[model samples]
Target chain A: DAVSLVERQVRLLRERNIEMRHRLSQLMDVARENDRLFDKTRRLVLDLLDATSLEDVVSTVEDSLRHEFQVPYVSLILFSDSRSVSSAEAHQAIGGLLSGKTVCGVLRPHELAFLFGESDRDEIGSAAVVSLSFQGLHGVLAIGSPDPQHYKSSLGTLFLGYVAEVLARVLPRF
Target chain B: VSLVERQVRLLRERNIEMRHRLSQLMDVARENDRLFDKTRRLVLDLLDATSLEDVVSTVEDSLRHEFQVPYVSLILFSDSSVSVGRSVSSAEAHQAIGGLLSGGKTVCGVLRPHELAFLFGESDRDEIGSAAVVSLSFQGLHGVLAIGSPDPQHYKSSLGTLFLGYVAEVLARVLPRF
Candidate 1:
């Protein structure tokens, strides 16, 4: 009887080990997918940096996002507070969130609810609003969605974050 | 009370009606002229467009306002297989196709063969279709301009060819400058 109990515990231990292996495999798959996405994003950023002009940059970003990520409707909305106008106060208010006093975050419809009107609310389903300070212009990159679920807070934003950084670096050239 | 007085009154009324009709006709003609002029200016500006991106944005903006279209997109071929040129859209129907472009894919920005055919062959017609696909030329590559219209008659095959032709030429010329 004692030997049989020990054998049963050993069997249970083996099952747990198998379960642990399965979980590890699942994690590895997720990591692999993440790596692939990161690679694609890196390539896109390089293309953006190679762009010679503002138009080139826009074209690169649009095409890259459309083809690489397969997301629909991307736009870069710039915000500026240099005028010190009360109208621009909203951007300044959000300044705390941006990097270098130039806040850039990938925003969705919920985040943009305050900026747009009712008509525009339905029109703009999802978007990534990256804040960046460009020369004197401070604003967001509003990437919209024909599909409402493309931009989410949980998605990895390393690439878009890099894009905001590049824009900040390229602001003087602009 | 005489036939002569009655005839004179009728003549005056008829003349007034004719004058009103003529003015209305003239107004319609003027409106058409204005539309044509705006189209021509748009074409000219597109021809002189400094970059591919500029041309695309201008084309999209113009199509949205003039054609009352919800979407306009242009996709050009690029150096790498993954790097196609340009795709711009004003509307949101074919967002998937544009998404593909952003992902670094080379497939032209189009939905299906029928949609492609309508854009390429039927847009100039009076029965404007749902979409349009115009071929664009770059320095060493060829590209496509895919436009999505909610209206079926906005892009018929017979409406006008000059504007489309001009757009193609403008893209071809300015592509190199970009």
Candidate 2:
């Protein structure tokens, strides 16, 4: 009976060691992923600020998110017509969304059409949108994903919100 | 047999300690995320700064209060000058810490006495145990951003000073306009 108890306890100890190893691997992967994400965000922020023109700002956001970040769909529309307006016609068809906060999830068919447009509209399943209005400058930035599950929560879109925040300040200058 | 059974439980208790350490690592990742977010906001604040006073104040306040550095100094180098913030002639800056000025990289350690004096000034120099300094030379802008700690080992390497480098980098770009 004594020998049987010792063998059983040793088996439990061995199982505990195996479980710890698995958890340690997962924690490390998350840490590495965040570190890489921060670097990408830092590079984008600097480029956005360094932009000298409105076109440069828009292109910087589009290129960085699309090519560099490998996102499926990206859009940055500045309601720059604030001769008190939009559309060229964005305000009428899509309407304005959240201000100073990012909203994420599946959107109305019209909203998708307005953001990514008819070309990529069918492909995009979920989106994160942020209003870029500061100092009277109004704009909207959005990124869409093919998988409906992605971009469904505001929590992971912190980087996008920050990008939008700086974009709001810098856009008014040009 | 009894002694052997106790050793088995002891190692199982060791597994519990490992989990606590894993939690510590998870906390570190979350802390890094927080720090990264703060840095993004601070950089955006720098961009919002329209005046030289606003720029200097924003940097000092955020670094000292939120980031919690013990001592902070931002020195602009010019053949010209400044009022609210300090600026020294380029020749003078070179005369004091020429090596640091030339690198355009961060220098972190217990700095030389005179170098510490040059950055933090003579009055507060002696109290600083360690410091990290970076040269600002973007687009012909010349300046120094330095932070000090009372702990001797706080700034032993450049590993932790990456955030400082980013601050200094953006500050250089923003300085030229103001």
Candidate 3:
């Protein structure tokens, strides 16, 4: 009976060890992922800073989102009232969505299609939408990824918020 | 050995591995926190910049106080046409930093005596053992931001240039505005 008890304890210890290893691996992955995101965000901010005009800012945002970040879909949704955005149709589509709050994580199929266009809806699994407001301009920067778990509801928005703050400060000057 | 003894040994091994993992995690956490603080301050300073002189002085002050660098200098090329009150605009000054500004490279390592003296001035030249030189370029503006350290290995050749590049890029954009 004592030997059997010892065997059970050994089994438990092995399970605990496996659990701890898994936890360690998860933490390591998180650290690495954070580093990559931080670097990408930093580069994005720098690229925005280098933008010389309103046109430059728009092009920079599009290129950085598509090429640098590998984001499957990116859209700069603007309010019609803003001088920076001139398209009446675009303003009509996204004007009601701006609440000066950042929305992130999975969206319903329709909501996903609305932000990323109908063609990209199937490919966009998750997204982060940051609201930007400066002077008379109000807009949203939406970044979508192909991986369903790429963005989570609980994921921190501090970096994205910083990027929005930068855009707000810079767009006014141009 | 008995089964219980064997289980105890396995548990001990797992405990050792867990401890090592915890130590590594802690180290990475500390580094991430430090880098975040530095980058946050850098962006904040750039946002607050209003004039060419303000951008230059603020960068130098932040590198010294926030980044804890021993020496810092901002050299603006004459073609920028921005009036810098305390900056050097002489031909010799341009010649001194011309190589760094032309290479389109971020240099990290020991600097020549003349280069060290040119960047940190004579008073602080001997104190600087190594440095990093980041080239800044804008529409017509060209410059170099130099950061010096007393430790010879502080700015090793293999040190990452991401932070320095960000600083240069920010300055390039901000300087042109003023």
Candidate 4:
């Protein structure tokens, strides 16, 4: 009976050790993630310092999110009053579409997101959105995700604020 | 019946342990993927940058803040008789980069021979640890972006080829803007 009791205690100890190791690994991962986010935010701000026009600023953000951060879809929607109307009109205004004012869509959302859904697997998730007013042009940056919970509305807005400040300085030239 | 019940309990315990381990592994894998994606976006931004000044500024800012490299520079071929066009450097790194440019071709022999020997002179080679000069040519203009790090391994020749290739290709497409 004593031998059986000792064996049972050893088994429990082994299970507890495994659980502790798993928790420790999770803590390490969270620490690393925080470090990465902090670094990327800093870099994004610095990139803005050299942006001279609205096109340059938006392109930089798009490239950073799509290629650097590897987000599947990224788009910038500007709140247009007249200039965007003219540019869209120049393209013949197909279906009376206001590409600028539509303002509430994913950047590269169509084919990639569709493929992920067809596979029935959770793939390609996470996004970042930034809001800005450049030369009276209000814009919203949106990133889409397969995970559905990557960019919650409740998350800190500091990084987005920095992006807005940069746009304010450089967007007028474009 | 008692022995059979004990065997079944052991199997259930093992199954639970396996499920927990699998969950942990999945979490780690997902986090790693996110980091990889972000790094790619950073390189892409560098490629699509507009002006030479914008590109240089982005490199410096990104490296300093994201990759934590304290210094970076982009050198373009001059329109004048001299080989170099323009250079951007951090306060401390400017001297070394400027010396390399003024010397003509000793450190980099693409320039005139007279300036080469006067600049290289032997000692400069060992002191400048990790360094890479990526050539830039678009719309008939030629230049180079030289990146150096105090850490000897930071700017190896083999590294940044993919990133620079993208930058060159994008610049080629957008040549009219420059």
Candidate 5:
């Protein structure tokens, strides 16, 4: 009876050890990923500052998201008041959907098409939309990924918000 | 060995592994905290800058005060209309910069005598054992930001450029407006 009880306890201890090891490994992975993303985001802010004009800002945003962050799709939608927004159709379309709120998750096909182009809509599984306000300029920065879990509703917005803050400050001067 | 003794040995091994993993996680957490704090302060300082003079002064002051480097300088190219701050010949300094401005890369390591003079002035040249150079482009204007230290190992060739790059990028965008 004593030997049987000791074996049972040992088995339980082994299971606990395995579970703890798995969790520790996951934490290590997350920490490394965070470091990479943080570095990239800081560089993106600098890139935004380097932009000479509103057009340059748009281009930098697109390039950074595409190359640096490796997001499948990226779009910058400005409100009617922004001097850079030349098309009334785009302004109206974006304004009708966002209504001054930040949204993220599995967006509908029409919403995806509205933000990214119609052709890219099918490829984007999820999206993160952030509201940006700089000087008199109001807009949204949309980041989309093919992976459904990439831009979920529960995803952290701290880095996106930081990027938007820099954009707001720099875009106005240009 | 008895069954109980073997089980105890296994448990001890697991405990040792757990302790090692915990220490590694703690080290990473500490590093992340330090990086975030430094960048946030630098960004906020740059954001408050209102003019080209303010930006230049802020950069030098922040590097000296926050980073504790022995020397800092913001070098800009001279134009026909207005010459402000330290100006150097585009052709002469271009050769010394080693494509820093043109190539858009940050260079760091022990400095040559001439490189040290170019960045830290003649008197301070001997004192600057190492340095970092980053390209700063403000609209049509272009220049380099240099930070120097007396310690030869202060800025090694393998040093991370993320923070310095961010500083240069902010200066590039903010300077043109002023």
Candidate 6:
């Protein structure tokens, strides 16, 4: 009877061990995701800083967000003498929202239309947008996802905000 | 002790240890995020450098004050000769720490006395117990950047040198342009 009791204890301990192992593996996966995101963010920031021209700035942002970040819809709009239809509306939509920090989630219908435009905006389910302002130089950087739940929280706003902050500073140079 | 009893005890201990490590790893990820932001600010300043002097002071001041590192060195290897502390030529640098510069990687741990003096100067080296060093060798730019701590246990591994390697890489690209 005592031997059987010890055997049962061993089996229970083994089961607990497996459960903790699974938990540990899950945490490791989270840490690895952070590492991957941090490296991608670093590369984007560095490329932005290295850019010497307006073309360089635009291409760097587009390629990094699309290819590196694996995001489908990436829009960077600058407030210049010549502005597009919805881009002008994009500024006012996000102007109050930005005040100082990033504004994200499933944006309002017109807000989405303003930033991504009526066509692509219709296709986008959720998005993150940051108002870029350094000195008097100002712009908008927005990225989108097809899943409405994708950007409902901070999700990836931490990296997005930092990227926009650097983008704001570097944009003034070009 | 019976074999089953021993087995049960070992497994429980292992379970607790793994649980502890999972909690520890979360805090580590948080700190990595903080470090990443600090490196970002420093990099922006380096990229903004318009002159060699601008790069030098930016690095020295940021690492010393902002990074809270006690000792910092940024010895630039020019095609020509030396300066008070910051500038040196290709030949002399190669002669001094050729292995490190040619290896083109971030280095960590304690160094010999002469290596310490060459990088941080003879006087400053006296208090430095350990350091991390990176050779900036992208294109025509050649230089060595070092950050030192009075504690020997510090900078004993490449674990914390991620940002240093990054800063050195960016500094290398900016150096030649200026």
Cα lDDT tens digits for candidate 4, A25-73:
7766865765566456546645654566667777787777667666665
Per-candidate RMSD vs. true structure? 28.1, 3.5, 5.9, 12.8, 7.2, 4.0
Interface RMSD of 4: 8.2
Higher-ranked by lDDT: 2 or 4: 2
Q: Count residue pairs with overlapping backbones in model 1.
A: 54
Worst 10 residues of 4 chain B by lDDT: B108-117
Better of 3 and 5 by DockQ: 3
Native contacts conserved, per model: 0.00, 0.62, 0.46, 0.00, 0.36, 0.64
Model 4 lDDT, residue A33, Cα: 68
lDDT by residue (tens digit), candidate 2, A1-174: 878888888888879878888888898998887777767777887897788887888888888888877888888877844412374576677765554667888888888988888878888888999888887746788899989888998766666887787778787777
- Which pairs clash (backbone N, Cα, C closer than 3 Å) in model 2? A87-A90
Candidate 3 whole-model C-alpha lDDT, 0 to 1: 0.70
Give the per-residue lDDT of model 3 (tens digit) for B1-178.
3758876787878777886887778676666667667866777678877777788888877777776666777777663355643355546565776666675443457677777777775375788777888767767545678777778776752222556667777778777776
Listed per prediction, chain B TM-scores read 0.49, 0.81, 0.71, 0.43, 0.67, 0.75
* Superposed model 4: Cα runs more than 4 Å off: A1-129, A143-148, A153-174, B1-74, B79-125, B150-152, B156-178
Q: Is the docking of candidate 2 incorrect, acceptable, medium or high quality?
A: medium
Kindly list the per-residue Cα lDDT of model 1 for residues A1-174, writing each as its tens digit: 655655555565556555655655665566466445544554564455456886676677667766776655555544434311232665444443344322223443344554443355576555555565544554555455545555554353344654565555454455
DockQ of each: 0.01, 0.54, 0.36, 0.07, 0.26, 0.48
Badly placed stretches (over 4 Å) of model 6 are A1-12, A82-98, B16-27, B47-54, B64-71, B78-85, B103-110, B121-131, B137-139, B148-161, B175-178
Cα lDDT tens digits, model 5, A64-157, are 8788877777787765534235446655555455543557788767778788889988888878887677555466788888887877864443
| Rank ordering of all candidates by DockQ, starting from the highest | 2, 6, 3, 5, 4, 1
lDDT of 5 by residue, B59-89 (tens): 7777776655568878876544254567776
State the local distance difference test value for candidate 1.
Answer: 0.50
Please tell me the interface RMSD, in Å, for model 3: 2.8
Model 5 interface CAPRI class? acceptable
Clashing pairs in 3: none
Best by lDDT: 2
lDDT of 1 at A156: 35
List residue ranges in candidate 2 displaced over 4 A: A1-9, A80-88, A96-99, B1-24, B79-82, B104-108, B121-129, B151-153, B156-159
How much is B2 displaced in model 1, in angstroms? 99
